[PDB]
């Protein structure tokens, strides 16, 4: 009657209890270092579990991101693309439920909510994670399963994250202030951080096996979504036919999965939350503003310049700026 996670939880807690701990973004919530990256304690226990128990298949398809870079969007797009033969846009399930219900996290749903329907359906091939490339379950890497990675301009990412954290259901305390939070982010003391190292390891992975990994960028998709959605569909093995294109199927998929559509659904309003298992966020927390450039409403020019420089120092000559 205990799940596999529950049977192993005490040993996971013992294990991580001696990993280095640093002050985090809430007073009762330290960050814990594993594999050169920093973690929330729960998410680290999930990651350890995934590492020990998750069994990927070659036909699986993994959505990979650092948080707040476009994960919910990609979840909607991937689900919509793979299932479009089943559903008209007007009766698609993404109209009634938050996209996170359709694409389970290997470090959150797998360990903590293994009884969700999607995880019992061997017909499901869609999964997500924020686990850094270097720390992925050995099964994932060995299966050869295809991956899509998304990243985002770091100022907007930080602001997406800092605002979002105000909305968490938690008794571990309020989030640190803007300046302390940003300092921590810049030092790489963030969940799944350092952000810039997260990106670079997947980017290296891509360069080594560009057939296996599709690298996407929030701002690029946001400004010109059609080519990238077609690219994604093709990479998934669900490319759009000439017939679908001329009947405007691609636009229908883009519209369904758009910020404006998703934000304005009853399912995603107010305090409404997921129906499959307990969330610590309301669905609405996932849709804030959906813009490029919102950092300028929050960060000083001095803060902006610090992170821009950090990015240009880390990525110069990698191809990521170029
Ligand atoms: N369908 C969509 N299209 C574009 N952006 C979306 C989106 N759904 C959510 N977002 C935005 O993507 C960010 C969340 O990323 P994640 O899904 O990785 O947690 C938030 O950015 P903002 O906080 O800038 O509004 C959110 O509003």
Numbering used by the authors: 26 to 347
Paper text:
Sulphotransferases (SOTs or SULTs) (EC 2.8.2.-) can be found in all organisms analysed so far. They catalyse the transfer of a sulfuryl group from the co-substrate 3′-phospho- adenosine 5′-phosphosulphate (PAPS) to a hydroxyl group of various substrates. Here we report crystal structures of the AtSOT18 binary complex with PAP and a ternary complex with PAP and sinigrin.
Several atomic positions occupied by the polar groups of sinigrin in the AtSOT18•PAP•sinigrin complex, including the sulphate moiety, are filled with solvent molecules in the AtSOT18•PAP complex structure. In the AtSOT18•PAP complex, the main conformation of Met186 is oriented away from the acceptor site. Our mutagenesis study showed that the disturbance of these interactions leads to a dramatic loss of enzymatic activity. This seeming contradiction is resolved by our AtSOT18•PAP complex structure, where the oxygen positions of the sulphate moiety are occupied by the oxygen atoms of ethylene glycol. The solvent oxygens in AtSOT18•PAP complex occupying the place of the sulfuryl group in the AtSOT18•PAP•sinigrin complex are very stable and have excellent electron density and low B-factors. The necessity to replace solvent oxygen atoms upon binding of the sulfuryl group leads to a near zero binding enthalpy balance, which explains the results of experimental kinetics analysis. The main contribution to the PAPS binding energy is thus provided by the PAP nucleotide moiety, which binds to a deep hydrophobic pocket between helices α3, α13 and α16, and the 3′-phosphate group. PAP is deeply embedded within the structure and stabilized by several hydrogen bonds and π-π stacking with surrounding amino acids. The four oxygen atoms of the 3′-phosphate group form six hydrogen bonds with the side chains of Arg177, Ser185, Arg313, and the main chain of Lys314 and Gly315. The oxygen atoms of the 5′-phosphate group make six hydrogen bonds to the side chains of Lys93, the main chain of Gly95, and both the main and the side chains of Thr96 and Thr97. The adenyl moiety of PAP is stabilized by hydrogen bonds with Cys282 and Tyr243, the stacking interaction with Trp98, and the hydrophobic contacts with Phe284 and aliphatic groups of Arg247.
